[PDB]
Write an enzyme that holds these catalytic residues in place. Sequence first.
Site, PDB file in Angstrom:
ATOM      1  N   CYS A  35       0.769  -1.227  -0.061  1.00 56.94           N
ATOM      2  CA  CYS A  35       0.023   0.016  -0.113  1.00 56.94           C
ATOM      3  C   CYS A  35       0.837   1.287   0.169  1.00 56.94           C
ATOM      4  CB  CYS A  35      -0.814  -0.105   1.333  1.00 56.94           C
ATOM      5  SG  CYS A  35      -2.271   1.496   1.227  1.00 56.94           S
ATOM      6  N   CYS A  38       0.428   4.000   2.825  1.00 63.49           N
ATOM      7  CA  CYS A  38       1.091   3.553   3.970  1.00 63.49           C
ATOM      8  C   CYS A  38       2.481   4.109   3.946  1.00 63.49           C
ATOM      9  CB  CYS A  38       0.978   1.946   4.099  1.00 63.49           C
ATOM     10  SG  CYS A  38      -0.830   1.286   4.314  1.00 63.49           S
TER      11      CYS A  38
END
Length: 111
Positions: A35, A38
């Site tokens: 991700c 993230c």
Amino acid sequence: AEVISVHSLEQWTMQIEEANTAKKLVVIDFTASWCGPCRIMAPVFADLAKKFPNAVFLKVDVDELKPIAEQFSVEAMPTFLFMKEGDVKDRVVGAIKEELTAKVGLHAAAQ
């Protein structure tokens, strides 16, 4: 202070029970390796952990610890969850640096 990466249910249990005994705020970054957002938030989260040593900052990989992600209905990442003495206090969803910073400041102070 450092961000504590939690890699097992045993580790989760230990961190939560120790924080609950000490009556301190727990902020959990629900993350994933793939991700992008993230990765952006990792330094922001680590910086906040240094700035607020009275609170416990945890990192949880949603693919590694599925029961914990499922427990809190985490399907969007990053999700930052705020918890104190068993109760969810707040949630920040997405790479929103200003909102995360403000909410840490709000919840980490004396209540």
